[PDB]
Design a protein around this ligand. Structure first.
Ligand SMILES: Cc1cc2nc3c(=O)[nH]c(=O)nc-3n(C[C@H](O)[C@H](O)[C@H](O)COP(=O)(O)OP(=O)(O)OC[C@H]3O[C@@H](n4cnc5c(N)ncnc54)[C@H](O)[C@@H]3O)c2cc1C
Ligand SMILES: Cc1cc2nc3c(=O)[nH]c(=O)nc-3n(C[C@H](O)[C@H](O)[C@H](O)COP(=O)(O)OP(=O)(O)OC[C@H]3O[C@@H](n4cnc5c(N)ncnc54)[C@H](O)[C@@H]3O)c2cc1C
Lengths: 684, 684
């Protein structure tokens, strides 16, 4: 039942269909090349060399290999990040980034003999992330081993909220230090209320198709679901869940569930002195700090219930590591495999340039324009047949929003406010061209992108000897030291992760992984932005001491009368002086870590998710596709970036075939036709 | 009916009662000293010299003057900010701060002869902010002149969202360049749906007491309403509104309103390419950028409807300036007045120290302990009879949350993780002491404080010659230049405010005032944090050019053949190079600008609002009060800081009288007894 290889994870999730694309398993669609292109020699640009852009590249290689003699695809990949792996063909980061897949290598002067790795971005991958594991198999093979990520509850964990302390492993009470814990009670209440039961009675508060989510998850994951079941989910039942609940936050939902349980007596008054509302609030906040298996979701309480429900259906917390020293190896290997699978019909060149503007212009064959700046701030303009914009929403905004919403006789585009050189384009149309005649349609896509919510996030890391965990001052529970700490100290979630360079002498002390307001509260103490140290040889000692100081709290435990400073203070202070670190995604050019939808945001994110369906309108000469987790219903996951890349390439095939969906494979067609179109066109 | 003096504004709002405190008009309660203290020589500390701490000092001065011969009050005021006015007897900030009332003086070498002032924090004051105007009268007199703040719609304004442009003053279509504007139409729909009508048919979507909110506002603002009507609001109808709608975001409410209006045909299809959901979404987002009179509330869409409704009942957008060069003068004058009114019976000493910890300890008469560090990190400990903690919630957390939740025999408190010296306290209880028996009650207040939401905010400023507004490319409305711009450019809201140091030669170009995600999106470009320039002599030129660059967009105006770069780019570029500035409240030690409650947060903030009622529990003997806009239902307003100060001193008087509320004036008593008590047991 635990997956032990890439192939086992891949096979586990191969059928799973997400509710906003319920007609299609993306892994099934991706089993063969997505479609066919007319003969020709294509000039394509990919803006961004992260997971989205590289998966797009790989699918373009699969397509290229199918082209006849004399045909081919040329791809220019634009990648502005100087630390990208694409430009590399104490704490080191150079060459160890693929966007938000980002490693920091801790070493003593020889990077080939390092101590540990900090996974600064992506680090844990759901078992049923079928497209993720599909690409991991391309990158590593099915035989490559994987491990269970040491999430709270997967390893012995300490939880602290207010006066409550718990030590536990799992959800079986036998393995909680307090089997009567209120934390375990509230967790069961909120799980019953949100997830419900896969068999028998329906007990969940927010049904889908009148039944518990657990039952719908099993349909969505079935190899061969009943006839019409996926269509009815896609067109009726999931839309009706959205209509009902997209205006309800996660935090509001938690409070509704707790309120009913408190009224029923499942959750008792917290002590004899708290009033009703106080007890209810206590339980909401207690559950908020505890979470669903990856730490407290209190900071995520403003997300739509719809967003949480996507994660529930997907069983998101059951996660694994990759068969790597650094997660960037996945994206690097996928980039290499893209070129291999092209069979010499795909040519790729990397540009170390920042794209500033996209548009359609002129009357030549290649009308999709990109304006960029190189490392010396010199301007470059290039025209393409098709472009895939593989950057998240805040980075996309300046590229697509500054050219207006209709034809312009001429525009002098570029970063004029920076004093950089502009380029005159003539007969200009916006890049995200939904209409030849409606500025509002063109404005809807741009304004949607610009108002998506990028969740704030930060990670504080240090290096510690793994043997520190064996000290008598580190609690043991069920035979192992505590290695995960979820707390209301300001640190939020902390992990002591064994080094993957190897038991290893060293561990990565992920002292704090924060989201949203938890991250905001820390940010004044980071010192340098987005990274401290900014240099390879420095150490963020001052910053880290502010984190240790947040752990300098007197914590009362049931096992001792005289409360003492929290043991975790001591553990954080056991980290070595060198190689103390923070990265703040919020002050990175991404303007945060990843998209999470607020109430109402579905209307914006789903427009982005469906945008590639513009290809159905043959009379609309739109050459631009988008590919990022920002344009998915899995912001915060490689799976979302990969799904958006698949959408982008499917749309590109349809556009290249001048609206003919038959150019898509049987299994890939639903990537376009299973969604509500963004342009109205005739039936069939 | 435009107010022209402090007294006119003061009288306008003198009766207004907020819905969470509907039994009392705070201005009326503040008219006379709040109560009486027993004879004694009191030792009090106020932590924080912002609006809350200084209003609290003022009220202590008024109390002190009532004490008999031989009695008095000594106050130690702790103020950590080196730039505080308390420690002072090119861009200058030294001496020009009173917490989040913060001015920057732009000058050329002689600060007595400056060019303009940037109001970095508070700047605009609702007419019906009665407590605000009550203290302004104490500081400046009723005769002092006031001006209308030049809000969007108060002065000629350009609004840009997507493809839509408007130029307007107010809400009368005769004063809009396009009287048929969809923007003005959606404003009428959303305002009608949220506020409704004061007379006639109820048209609002979310009634209070089964009627439109406008009708309730007229009762809350009445001189003599039926007492029974106020009590029913306080105990039944406002609580019922909260029960229903605390789980509904503003954004969700706007969508509900727009959906019903669309279905009714009140709002037409957005051009007849856009389908139903696209039209509704367009309108929701258009309204989002337009706002309620102070710019778009899109970034505020996650607030609870309850929070928005507080602002709707208060008519918050109708705002004025103060009779000052710099807003800090208000707070300074209130500090001087406190000392004047104390009539020799108040002695005040300022300490330039950061409080690190508070607790109750020991067995002496003074048990309210404060542990602090001076500007060279030397430790200090002092005990007091009473303490007012006048700091916002993220600054309060480390002071009150690291001592546990119950009696402890001994603790070594302080900032040990920073390497700073600790102090041993014996027989220690938490400072926010709600129970002698409940650690959960002590934990509830601490945990609530720590999880309040501090809204993020930033202001980008530059200095511009006022005459730039006369350039031929600056649009006019009836001959007056546009002086406010509300846009989806990333800048959010922009103002060209005449210098108060004087038609003035210069203006303060508030290039961008952002909240929440709008601020997050900019933050990577600020360069230095919290302030660029960090020095008196620098300029934030690179940062500011990134803001000019956001304005470099092709904007199409109706009737024009083609788009040209937006004129507002040209205006921003006219600012001089020197004295370009950003302040990021988010990276200040406040960890943001001001509290705004999310869905579910009422129960957290309201616990804080009611905390001073602990004074009713006589034997508890808790000596700590809290005083900040974080502990109010008006986060983001001086009104909230002032209300919380009034609550704190009212509570202190009852505590000083061992629980006897008869020691409050008749008019002040409801400040304590008109709220639900925070301690159920013991009663009182
Ligand atoms: C803190 C954090 C935690 C996460 N945890 C997980 C996890 O455990 N598991 C998981 O599956 N996912 C996780 N994710 C999400 C995962 O990292 C992302 O979904 C994925 O990496 C995003 O890929 P992308 O292609 O959409 O965008 P990005 O990774 O942002 O890549 C975009 C690329 O475009 C480049 N670029 C941007 N603008 C320009 C421009 N104008 N011109 C040229 N180049 C440009 C960038 O430099 C970058 O390399 C996490 C991410 C973060 C930050
Ligand atoms: C961007 C922005 C815009 C605003 N706009 C308006 C507006 O137009 N109108 C309006 O009415 N209000 C506005 N406000 C709100 C108004 O500024 C606040 O409500 C009010 O100033 C807060 O006062 P306070 O006493 O609660 O806290 P603060 O002003 O935060 O004062 C707390 C004081 O305590 C000190 N301190 C903190 N921690 C310690 C410690 N540990 N030891 C010692 N000293 C400490 C601080 O240095 C500070 O001086 C705005 C605020 C901001 C930031």
């Amino acid at each position: 039942k635990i997956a032990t290889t890439v192939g086992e994870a891949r096979l586990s999730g191969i059928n799973y269909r997400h509710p906003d694309s319920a007609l299609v398993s993306y892994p099934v669609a991706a089993a063969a090349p997505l479609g066919r292109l007319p003969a020709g020699n294509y000039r394509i640009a990919i803006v961004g060399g992260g997971a989205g852009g590289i998966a797009a590249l790989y699918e373009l290689g699969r397509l290229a290999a199918t082209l006849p003699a004399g045909s081919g695809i040329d791809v220019q990949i634009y990648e502005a990040d100087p630390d990208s792996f694409l430009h590399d063909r104490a704490i080191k980061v150079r060459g160890l980034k693929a966007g938000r897949v980002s490693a920091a290598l801790v070493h003593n002067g020889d990077p080939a003999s390092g101590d540990t790795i900090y996974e600064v971005g992506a680090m844990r991958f759901p078992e049923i992330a079928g497209l993720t594991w599909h690409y991991a198999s391309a990158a590593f093979g099915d035989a490559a081993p994987i491990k269970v990520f040491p999430n709270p509850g997967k390893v012995p964990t300490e939880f602290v909220f207010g006066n409550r302390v718990d030590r536990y492993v799992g959800s079986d009470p036998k393995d909680w230090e307090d089997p009567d814990s209120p934390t375990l009670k509230v967790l069961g209440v909120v799980a019953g209320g949100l997830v419900g039961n896969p068999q028998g009675e329906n007990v969940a508060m927010y049904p889908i198709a009148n039944v518990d989510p657990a039952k719908i998850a099993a349909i969505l994951n079935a190899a061969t679901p009943p006839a019409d079941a996926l269509e009815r989910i896609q067109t009726k039942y999931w839309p009706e869940f959205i209509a009902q609940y997209d205006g309800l936050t996660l935090g509001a939902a938690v409070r509704e569930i707790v309120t009913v349980a408190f009224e029923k007596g499942t959750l008792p008054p917290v002590d004899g002195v708290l009033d009703v509302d106080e007890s209810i609030s206590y339980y909401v906040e207690l559950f908020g700090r505890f979470g669903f298996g990856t730490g407290g979701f209190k900071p995520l309480y403003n997300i739509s219930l719809v967003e949480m429900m996507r994660l529930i259906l997907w069983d998101y917390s059951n996660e694994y590591t990759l068969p790597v020293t650094e997660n960037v190896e996945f994206i690097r290997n996928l980039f290499l495999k893209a070129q291999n699978v092209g069979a010499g019909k795909l040519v790729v060149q990397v540009r170390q340039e920042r794209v500033a503007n996209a548009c359609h212009s002129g009357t030549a064959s290649a009308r999709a324009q990109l304006l960029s700046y190189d490392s010396h701030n010199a301007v470059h303009s290039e025209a393409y047949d098709f472009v895939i914009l593989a950057v998240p929403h805040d980075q996309l905004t300046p590229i697509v929003s500054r050219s207006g919403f209709e034809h312009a006789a001429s525009q002098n585009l570029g970063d004029a406010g920076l004093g950089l050189e502009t380029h005159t384009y003539n007969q200009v149309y916006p890049p995200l061209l939904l209409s030849d005649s409606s500025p509002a349609a063109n404005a809807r896509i741009v304004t949607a992108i610009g108002q998506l919510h990028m969740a704030r996030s930060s990670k504080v890391f240090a290096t510690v000897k793994t043997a520190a965990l064996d000290q008598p001052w580190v609690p043991q529970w069920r035979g192992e030291p505590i290695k995960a700490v979820v707390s209301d100290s300001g640190l939020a979630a902390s992990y002591v992760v064994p080094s993957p360079i190897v038991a290893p002498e060293y561990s990565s002390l992920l002292a704090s992984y924060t989201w949203e307001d938890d991250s905001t509260r820390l940010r004044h103490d980071f010192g340098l932005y987005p990274q401290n140290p900014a240099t390879e040889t420095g150490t963020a000692d001052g910053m880290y001491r502010t984190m240790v100081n947040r752990a300098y709290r007197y914590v009362k435990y049931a096992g001792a009368s005289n409360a003492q400073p929290w043991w975790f203070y001591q553990l954080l202070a056991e980290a070595r002086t060198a190689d103390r670190f923070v990265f703040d995604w919020t002050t990175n050019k991404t303007a945060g870590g990843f998209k999470l939808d607020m109430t109402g945001d579905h209307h914006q994110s789903n427009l982005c998710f469906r945008y590639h369906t513009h290809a159905l309108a043959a009379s609309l000469d739109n050459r631009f596709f988008i590919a990022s987790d920002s344009y998915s219903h899995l912001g915060g996951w490689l799976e979302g970036a990969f799904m958006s890349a698949l959408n982008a390439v499917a749309g590109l095939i349809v556009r290249a075939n001048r609206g003919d969906v038959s150019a898509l494979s049987t299994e890939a067609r639903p990537l376009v036709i299973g969604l509500r179109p963004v342009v109205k066109v005739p039936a069939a």
